[PDB]
Amino acid sequence: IKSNEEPLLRKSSRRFVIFPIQYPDIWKMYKQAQASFWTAEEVDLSKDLPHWNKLKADEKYFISHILAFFAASDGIVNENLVERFSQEVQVPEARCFYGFQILIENVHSEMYSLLIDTYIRDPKKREFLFNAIETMPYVKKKADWALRWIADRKSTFGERVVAFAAVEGVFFSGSFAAIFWLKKRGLMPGLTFSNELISRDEGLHCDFACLMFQYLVNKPSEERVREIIVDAVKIEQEFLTEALPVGLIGMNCILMKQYIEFVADRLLVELGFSKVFQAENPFDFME
Amino acid sequence: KSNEEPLLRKSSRRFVIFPIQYPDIWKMYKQAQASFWTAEEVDLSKDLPHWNKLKADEKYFISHILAFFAASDGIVNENLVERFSQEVQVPEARCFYGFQILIENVHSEMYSLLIDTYIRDPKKREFLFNAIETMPYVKKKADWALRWIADRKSTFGERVVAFAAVEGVFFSGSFAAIFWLKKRGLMPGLTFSNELISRDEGLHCDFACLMFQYLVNKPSEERVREIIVDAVKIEQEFLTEALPVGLIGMNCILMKQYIEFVADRLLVELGFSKVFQAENPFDFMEN
C-alpha cells in the first residue's frame, strides 16, 4: 500500500531483528539515549527546601504551577503518541530509540511527582492544585492542537512527525527556560539539575523527530509545517505571557515571547525550512 | 468487562505517581531498573575459538536456537507496545512495561550480535536473520505469539497467561540447553548473556503472574490449562523433533520432562494446580 513508498513505514519481517544495522545515524542516536540513562533517585533533593522557603509568594505560585503543568502533560490525550510511532515505524533502529523514549518519559513523570511532593507537603494543597490545573486553558489548548494535527483522520505521517517535533521542542520550551532562570539566580539545585536532564532528553527526542523527517518521501508543504509550529508557538506564548506570566519570577514577558519564536525558528531550520520570525535568542543563560 | 478490573479501569490512572498505591508492582519496577544492562557489557571475544572446535551438529543446533531467539524478543515487544502497556492503566504497571520494552530491545541486540559473531558467511547469516520465514518451526512459534497480539476476541487475563507462556515455556528449553553448554565449559559469551536474559525473562514471567493476581475476573482453570498445555506441546515438538537436543548431547526425554516442570511451576504461580507433576531432571538448573 502507500506506506511501501516510505522506507520508514514499509512492512517487513525484518522489523523484529536488529542486525544488520542499515541506518547508522538512527542507531547512533539510540546509543546516545542509552548513554544518558538516569533514574529519579539520582537527583539529590536534600538542599532544596531551604531555597524553596526563601522564594516569595508570587514565585512559589509560579513554580508550583509549572510543576503541576509538567505533571499533567503525561495525562493528556497524546499519552500514547510514542507508542503509536513505535508501531507505525518499521525500522528496528528507530523502534529501539522509541523504546528508550518511553522509558525515559516515565522517569520524567516520577521526577516531577517527587519534586511536587518535596515542595508541597500538604496533600490537601496538592489535591487542590492538581484539580484546578486540569481545568486550565493551556491543557485544553494543547489537547485541541493534538486532536487537530495528530488525531485527525486526514493527518499524514509527515504532518504527525512535525507535530511530534513540536511537542518535544516547542511545548514546554518556555518552562524549561524559566527554570534555567532560577538556576541563574542560584536557587533550588535539585529542581534545576533535574530540569537540565529532562530538557536535554526532550532536545534529543526533538532531534530524533527531525532526523525521521529527513527520511520522508512525502513531506508536508512549508506552509503546512508553519501552520503546525506557529499554532504551537501561540499556545506556549499565551501561557507564559498571559495565563501564568513569567514576571511572577522576575523575567520579562516580551523577551520570553522572543525566545519561544527563536526556538520555533530553530526547529523550522532543523526541519529544512526557512525562518518565519527572525527572532534572536534574548537569553545569554540559554546560549 | 474492563470496567470491573482495577488494572484496566480509567479511574486507576492518577495525576501523579506518588504516593504509591501498589507497592508490590512498584517494587518489581525498581527490581527491573536495578537489572539494567547493555549488550556491549558481554565480551564475545573468546567464543569464536570455541565455536570453531564444535562439531557440525553442535553448530547446527546453536545457530538455529539463536535464529529463533533473534526474532522472538521483538515480538514480545510489539505486544507490550501495542497491547499491554497501553491497556493497563495502573501507573506502577506501565512503568514496569516500559522497562520491559527497553530490556527486550537489549535482548534482540544481544542475539543479533551473537549471530553476527558466529556466522561469517553472509548467505548463511541472511538465512538465520530471516528465520521467521526461512525456518518452519520458528515460524510456527512466532505465528502463535503474533495471533495473540492480533486477537481482538480474548480477554486481558487470557492474553497475559499466553505471553507468560511465551516467556516462561517457549524460551525455557533453549535457556536450559545453553546452561548445558555452560556445564560443559563452552562459549562464555553465549552462556553469560543467557544468564542475564533468562533472569530477565524470569522477572517478566513473575510480573505476569503478579498482574494475574489483581484480576477480579480470571479465566477458568480449564482455559488456563489449554493455553499452557498447547505451549508445552509446541515447545516439546521443537526441541525433541524439529531441532533435537541430542545434537548437543542432551537426553530428549529429560528435556520434555523439564519443559513440563517449567509449565507446572507457571500454573502453581498463577494459583492453579499442577497438570504434569514433572520433577526437574536437571541438577544444573537447581543452582
Q: From residue A112, how far is each of A66, A73, A80, A109, A195 by CA, in Å?
A: 10, 11, 19, 5, 10
Residue linked to cell 503509536 = A84
Task: Give me the DSSP letters along A30-48.
Answer: HHHHHHT---GGGS--TTH
Query: B69, B83, B105, B119: best mutation site toward chain A, by most A Cβ within 10 Å?
Result: B105
The Cα–Cα gap between B261 and B228 comes to: 12
Measure in Å the smallest separation between the Cα of A270 and chain B Cα atoms: 28
Asked whether the beta carbons of residue A19 and residue B102 sit closer than 8 angstroms, the reply is no
Phi, psi angles (nearest 5°) of residue A138: -60, -40
The Cα–Cα gap between B7 and B88 comes to: 6
Task: Give me the DSSP letters along A212-224.
Answer: HHHT-SSPPPHHH
Asked whether the beta carbons of residue A16 and residue B133 sit closer than 8 angstroms, the reply is no
The Cα–Cα gap between A82 and B7 comes to: 21
Exposure string for A31-44, b = 16+ CB within 10 A, e = fewer: eebbeeeeebeebe
Contact status of A100 with chain B (Cβ, < 8 Å)? yes
Asked whether the beta carbons of residue B113 and residue A71 sit closer than 8 angstroms, the reply is no
Per the CB < 8 A criterion, the answer to whether A172 and A73 are in contact is yes
**Rounded (5°) CA angle B254-B260-B263:** 150
The Cα–Cα gap between A207 and A230 comes to: 18
**Which one-letter amino acid corresponds to residue A38?**
W
Cell matching residue B247: 545434537
Per the CB < 8 A criterion, the answer to whether A33 and A203 are in contact is no
- For residue B37, give the nearest of B105, B83, B92, B98 by alpha carbon: B105
Asked whether the beta carbons of residue B108 and residue A87 sit closer than 8 angstroms, the reply is no
Cell matching residue B233: 506441546
Per the CB < 8 A criterion, the answer to whether B229 and B162 are in contact is no
DSSP code of residue A21 = -
**Which one-letter amino acid corresponds to residue B126?**
E
Chain A residues inside the 8 Å CB shell of B105? 18, 95-96, 99-100
The Cα–Cα gap between A165 and A268 comes to: 10
Contacts of A252 (CB under 8 A, 6+ apart): A246
Is residue B73 annotated as involved in ligand binding?
yes
Query: A12, A14, A17, A109: best mutation site toward chain B, by most B Cβ within 10 Å?
Result: A17
Contact status of B36 with chain A (Cβ, < 8 Å)? yes
Helices and strands (H and E) in chain A: how many: 12, 0
Task: Give me the DSSP letters along B43-102.
Answer: --TTHHHHHTTS-HHHHHHHHHHHHHHHHHHHHHHHHIIIIIHHH---HHHHHHHHHHHH
The Cα–Cα gap between A77 and A284 comes to: 35
Contact status of B99 with chain A (Cβ, < 8 Å)? yes
Instruction: Establish whether the linkage from the previous residue to A282 is cis, with ω within 30° of 0.
Output: no
The Cα–Cα gap between B88 and A78 comes to: 16
**Which of B36, B102, B116 lies nearest to residue A99, judging by beta carbons?**
B102
- For residue B177, give the nearest of B65, B265, B278 by alpha carbon: B65
- A74-77, Cβ contacts within 8 angstroms, sequence gap of 24 or more: A74/A105, A74/A108, A74/A109, A75/A134, A75/B13, A75/B15, A76/A139, A76/A142, A76/A143, A76/A146, A77/A143, A77/A146, A77/A147, A77/A151
The Cα–Cα gap between B236 and B169 comes to: 10
Measure in Å the smallest separation between the Cα of B185 and chain A Cα atoms: 28
What method was applied to determine this entry? Answer: X-ray
Residue linked to cell 491543557 = A139
Per the CB < 8 A criterion, the answer to whether B22 and B90 are in contact is yes
Contact status of A42 with chain B (Cβ, < 8 Å)? no
The Cα–Cα gap between A8 and B78 comes to: 16
Asked whether the beta carbons of residue A106 and residue B94 sit closer than 8 angstroms, the reply is yes
Is residue B221 annotated as involved in ligand binding?
no
Contacts of A263 (CB under 8 A, 6+ apart): A169, A170, A173
Catalytic residue flag (residue A61): no
DSSP code of residue A188 = -
**Which one-letter amino acid corresponds to residue B104?**
E
How many angstroms is the resolution? 2.2
The CATH fold assigned to A1-287 is Ribonucleotide Reductase, subunit A (1.10.620)
* Rg value, chain B, Cα: 19
Asked whether the beta carbons of residue A95 and residue B109 sit closer than 8 angstroms, the reply is no
The Cα–Cα gap between A144 and A150 comes to: 10
Number of CB pairs, chain A paired with chain B, less than 8 A apart: 97
Exposure string for B120-141, b = 16+ CB within 10 A, e = fewer: eeeeebebbbbbbeebebbbeb
Contacts of B266 (CB under 8 A, 6+ apart): B164, B165, B168, B169, B205, B209, B228
Contacts of A42 (CB under 8 A, 6+ apart): none
Chain B residues inside the 8 Å CB shell of A110? 17-18, 95
The Cα–Cα gap between B274 and B276 comes to: 6
Asked whether the beta carbons of residue A87 and residue B81 sit closer than 8 angstroms, the reply is yes
- For residue A74, give the nearest of A161, A162, A202, A226 by alpha carbon: A202
Cell matching residue A4: 511501501
What is the three-class DSSP state of A126?
Answer: helix
**Which one-letter amino acid corresponds to residue A99?**
G
Is residue B104 annotated as involved in ligand binding?
yes
Per the CB < 8 A criterion, the answer to whether B238 and B255 are in contact is no
SS3 of chain B: the string is CHHHCCCCCHHHCCCCCCCCCCHHHHHHHHHHHHCCCCHHHCCCCCHHHHHCCCCHHHHHHHHHHHHHHHHHHHHHHHHHHHHHHHHCCCHHHHHHHHHHHHHHHHHHHHHHHHHHHHCCCHHHHHHHHCHHHHCHHHHHHHHHHHHHHHCCCCCHHHHHHHHHHHHHHHCHHHHHHHHHHHHCCCCHHHHHHHHHHHHHHHHHHHHHHHHHHCCCCCCCHHHHHHHHHHHHHHHHHHHHHHCCHHHHCCCHHHHHHHHHHHHHHHHHHCCCCCCCCCCCCCHHHCC
Is residue B167 annotated as involved in ligand binding?
yes
Asked whether the beta carbons of residue A19 and residue B71 sit closer than 8 angstroms, the reply is no
Active-site pick, B22, B111, B118, B258: B111
Cell matching residue B132: 521467521
**Which one-letter amino acid corresponds to residue B43?**
D
Active-site pick, A30, A112, A119, A138: A112
Measure in Å the smallest separation between the Cα of A57 and chain B Cα atoms: 24
* CA B194 to chain CA centroid, nearest Å: 11
